[PDB]
Design a protein around this ligand. Sequence first.
Ligand SMILES: [Mg+2]
Ligand SMILES: [Zn+2]
Ligand SMILES: [Zn+2]
Ligand SMILES: [Zn+2]
Lengths: 87, 171, 107, 97, 166, 267, 543, 112
Amino acid sequence: LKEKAIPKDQRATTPYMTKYERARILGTRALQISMNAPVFVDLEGETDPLRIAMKELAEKKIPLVIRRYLPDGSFEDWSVEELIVDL
Amino acid sequence: MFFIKDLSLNITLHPSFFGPRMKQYLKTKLLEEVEGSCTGKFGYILCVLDYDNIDIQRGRILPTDGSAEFNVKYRAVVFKPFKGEVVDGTVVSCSQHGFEVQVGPMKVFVTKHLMPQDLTFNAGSNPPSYQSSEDVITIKSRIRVKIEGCISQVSSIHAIGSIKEDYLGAI
Amino acid sequence: IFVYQNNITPSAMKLVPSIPPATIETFNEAALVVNITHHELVPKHIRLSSDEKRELLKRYRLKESQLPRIQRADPVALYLGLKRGEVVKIIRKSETSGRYASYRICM
Amino acid sequence: LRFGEMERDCMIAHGAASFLKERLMEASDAFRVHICGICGLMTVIAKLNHNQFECKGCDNKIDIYQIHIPYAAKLLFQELMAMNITPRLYTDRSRDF
Amino acid sequence: RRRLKKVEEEENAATLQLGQEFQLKQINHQGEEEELIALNLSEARLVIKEALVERRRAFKRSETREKELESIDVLLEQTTGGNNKDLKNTMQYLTNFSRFRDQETVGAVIQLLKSTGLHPFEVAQLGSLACDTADEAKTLIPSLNNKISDDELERILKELSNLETL
Amino acid sequence: RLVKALEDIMVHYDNTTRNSLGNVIQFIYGEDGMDAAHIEKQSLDTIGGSDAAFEKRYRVDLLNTDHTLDPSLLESGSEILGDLKLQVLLDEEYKQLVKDRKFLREVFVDGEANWPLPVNIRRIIQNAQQTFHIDHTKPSDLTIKDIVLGVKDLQENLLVLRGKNEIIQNAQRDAVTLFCCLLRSRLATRRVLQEYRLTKQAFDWVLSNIEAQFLRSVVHPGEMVGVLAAQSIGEPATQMKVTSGVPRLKEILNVAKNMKTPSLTVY
Amino acid sequence: VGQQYSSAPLRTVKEVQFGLFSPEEVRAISVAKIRFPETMDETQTRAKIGGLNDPRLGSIDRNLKCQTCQEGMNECPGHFGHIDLAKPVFHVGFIAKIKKVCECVCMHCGKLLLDEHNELMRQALAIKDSKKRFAAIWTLCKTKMVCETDVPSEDDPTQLVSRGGCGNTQPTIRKDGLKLVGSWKKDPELRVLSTEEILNIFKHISVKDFTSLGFNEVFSRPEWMILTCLPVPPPPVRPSGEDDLTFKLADILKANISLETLEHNGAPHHAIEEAESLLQFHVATYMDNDIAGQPQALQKSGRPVKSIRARLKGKEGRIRGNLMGKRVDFSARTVISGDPNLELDQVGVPKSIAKTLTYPEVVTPYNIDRLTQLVRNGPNEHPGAKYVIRDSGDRIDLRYSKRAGDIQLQYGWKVERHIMDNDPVLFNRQPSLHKMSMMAHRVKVIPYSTFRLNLSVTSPYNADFDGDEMNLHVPQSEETRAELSQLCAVPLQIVSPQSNKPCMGIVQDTLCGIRKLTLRDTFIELDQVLNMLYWVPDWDGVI
Amino acid sequence: AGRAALYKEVYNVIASDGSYVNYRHMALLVDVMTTQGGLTSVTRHGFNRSNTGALMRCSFEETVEILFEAGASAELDDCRGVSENVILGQMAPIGTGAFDVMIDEESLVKYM
DNA sequence: CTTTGTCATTTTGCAGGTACTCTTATTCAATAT
RNA sequence: CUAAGAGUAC
DNA sequence: ATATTGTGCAAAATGACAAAG
Ligand SMILES: [Mg+2]
Ligand SMILES: [Zn+2]
Ligand SMILES: [Zn+2]
Ligand SMILES: [Zn+2]
């Protein structure tokens, strides 16, 4: 793992969250909320787990990290907090 | 003998448990499953060294399940008996077929075939013992034994010891 | 480079590979009348040095087999005297971005 | 309803991997089978109530894994075995990418 | 490799074939290789006590044989919970057959055995077994045959016996 | 057959296009790293026109009168004339435009000027004009140095490849060369100050929007471009002297030794 | 209820290592030696012990647990038996390969014909991929017809170095059906190469030789291309009226017993040869019944037998027909109709279909009330629920459950309930030539028996309303639901990557209408203007 | 030059009926067809003969022959292709599956 | 004398995607227990 | 139930 | 009286065969 992981200081992937990453983050977080996971945001009455996950993503309170795998087997860890959600 | 080795264990956490005390839950669940345990691959597992910072890594959400698969790496102190190794111990029980000696956490059964002929069982003694011309082996008696045969089961390691060789017996 | 008129006797072909590192290359005159590399379909081929190949493989994390291949009988490869394992950088006029650089390893 | 090949291709082009897996496994046929880490074959005798797993031949009882594969996949592997082919399934990499 | 089946020479301490995963070098959790260290009974007991006292301190922030046995029992009850039968038996066995008391003596023993440049299994066995003479050590440990000079082994066993306390 | 052939092709996190073996098919997707859905047809102004028309459209000279600029165009329109450093900036900008003209005329031999490119600059200019209420009469607040340095910084900010070595930097420059040609063709000093008459805040907004849109037009890693290409080629085939249509498509995909109409073109 | 809990660790398959069965591996994995060709005993109520349906291979009756694993037919994978063949036979799939291998190796000493001393051999052995190595080796050694016990030295062609060669002459090998005939050069001597001698010569090939040929030391050795122990698939593979595989296995057992008795009792070589050829034919047609030249092994009914290769190939084989594409649950299909009053991303769903298809919603403090209400409503009225799955895996059917009284839902349970409005659903029309022909829509429950969709979305689907049918798929998890809504949604597909332009537009009546509405002549009075303004949902309210 | 001519031919075919397809799709097609140094046909004789994994190769054509050859040659399938994971019924490494979602315990504690 | 390229044969594997309904048929006949 | 065939819808 | 057995491509591969050294 030590050789596979690329150090944080020299990650060369895009700093923007991809559409697939956003889709899977929302799906995973919605599924976890649906299984009674703690919520890190205040709720304005929303009840759908998916839109709860969207609200969590809007203010970067999702405690997950993407492990982007390079073709050679190496990978980069990008926290959802630092990824820029532009799309 | 007592060693310390680098072990890893895959734990899975339910979505309900992901809270600020997740590290505590992972550390506790490593215990109660590895502490005091026995495996055939590495012998007994007695304790885990370096509790202050156990490498828990990141964890991995299982798709369609939501549970996270952590691969917790740690240092564990183990006791793996080996064939043909001399070690001290104490007798706890005796019988017709042989007697049991307590070495660390394991019990080694020395069979009646693997004692000098002068040493013979005696059930008349209370508790029953093994008596010879020069010495007697009873309960709570120190004895040095050489392990010559090990069968590696998982939840119960079984070893065969003997004192037939020179300078083996009571100390 | 041996430039012949019509053909080579096959019994002469077998002894074309001499003792290394010397290499012998045969060309037919009829195949050399027109310089193929001046065709607008043929892009720019630049042989890479061993250091350049090592840097390329390091930067793209590639193995030898993961590069696009160029046969060691391709007319451009014969033109440049490519040998197996050597990588040519191809510069192409692309219609989406002005310039596109590819690489091909001689096999 | 038949979820044909080119429907799968459209789902691939959309990039929805989890939905494709859900269609092909939870919606049609999900079968849990046991294999051993020595030989990748499904020749593991599993007594779940007694909690006893054992691959005869390899003579092992702790190198067992369970995998969720389509029942059609299990049938395919068994038909390969009956035709003298060993589709050994392994849960860890032995080579680098 | 992923060889199906497996052919292996039977484990034998005298042959020093401790196992493919008991080789001299082991890749640590940090990725580098370290020597396979082996703990003698006194050293192992001290290591266990250090680990348990560290755990007790972490929980708090978050000699004679009888008194030592009572103290280790109290600390064992305080630190860990259940399924300590094996751990308890090992701990009492260690306190009973402990060849040394404190850190300084076990450190001296380990550096003295290190000076020999000998196998870790063999030095741990020497530090664990309270042997007296030299041919006795050779017959106890067949792995030591044709590895160390007779006089050196006898003398080092003499200093080890001298270092014995209580 | 097409879908099966291209099924495993994917764009990876290093922007290369690879199959299941990790073999590189394209070192950057589509040779520009752009998503097809974000591409629009736009005109390259530098390639077309006459040399005199090109000079009139772009050439700006602060030391003569044939290609001078009206001082009313910008705020400091009567002080810049006679300057040297600003003349140096205009000279390098015009030289770059001439080089782009030559480069595009090399790339597109027929001289076609309308090509599909990621960011639609014209719409951005119109949005800025209608958002900041450009009156087309007030002198511009922009300075020439601001225009040139802003364009150069924008070119520096259009990142497709994020690596930090010579290979990746050269690939990045090759990736954005054509879009930068378009950008220089549009956001020239003459055009900005005269045709569009941007202001300072409007020019900054245009630059920020161009950067954001270009970053949003980059293809996303994990895109299954092989299946997409197979379907995009196969779907029109259903709608369908020299053979053409489906029989010719079959002759192409099945690399056939003998084809019905082998014809050769001589110039 | 699914499958009960298993304590074995759960992993995903990372690598698939192919190979061939060694006969000893076949014997090791087998749980029963099949000896009798019959399936059921004389009582015709049980499975004969040692027969083709030995209870150790798995139970053929739902009421009986498997005799090996003591698990029901729901769990037991089935366990292989083994038929110990009287004499070795060729594997029908490998015959050509076997020929090539035996054409590359000496038929007497079992060593590869052209060692590295030969010139082109270094080039051939230098190749990396096994297939090209074997092709080069074969095209080099197929024309060598002598073992070459002594060869000119690599240093120079003056002295002779003797390899481990016997010096015999190799034959020219052809295939006549299921057997190989070798013609030795006349000093031609034509004779059938017995499978036993070929097996022997393959067993004598050195490790280096066959790993150069492209075989593996651990997973596939050439002598494993010869069958000596047929694995017997369990009843799961050939369920029962017996399956065609069962009949072929019975025929194989019959031929095996006939050959074994003819050998034991002695017989003319003609009878033994005929019985051997019959066993070979049966074993071959059991694996591949479409052999070119040979006649198909007909079934009792006079139709060709379905071999395993037939079960695997084709559009209806296992791979294409059951793995690359398979029939799925939670899907609907019906005729489509247009609706100008539906949004672009909306789909009209018949109430009966909405009452049939269901989604499992996990019970949460946020949806306890409405899920309880749906459970109260039951499955016969929309909106409602059809099942309640408890944390233990037990399933409660809302039909017949109202007798037991109202169910008290608990967090973590699942309510499998009717699909309601705004539920993301995949909508598809076939042939479905591109990704836009399969898009995510929002459910709108409507009181008629057709799917309803916006007129603009018909262009990507290439759909009319002259009888077209369309299919609907319901995601069954929050992850699939979410990625369906966030990647395949209709609005996200408006601009197609196919030609970097929108794929949906204004079509048909509206298109004509809009042209008529925007003419210069067209003027609208106050009342119609107010109507048209109110018809725009997001109109800001200013005239 | 062969790749450029191939792209020109494919483009001519597509544009014969006046249709338009973006450059990158035909570019990808011709790049795949010519990535091996020669003209690799889209046929069982072409792309299906590349050593790209037996399970995905067999899903196209010549299925059982491919399985037999893979067994004889003891091929290793690393399960990187889409067809392999479809057959095994696990999330393919495409789109949403081209990465792993993991947990930042430090961030989780940091939120409260 | 053996290549050597070359034609003329042989294989030989394939042949859009979903979906609906109905009809027939499951070895014939002779022999022996 | 299975298989084969025929007709048919887009 | 009834169970048991007597098709049209089109590429690839292969073989036959007049010329060449
Ligand atoms: Mg229609
Ligand atoms: Zn096994
Ligand atoms: Zn069973
Ligand atoms: Zn020989």
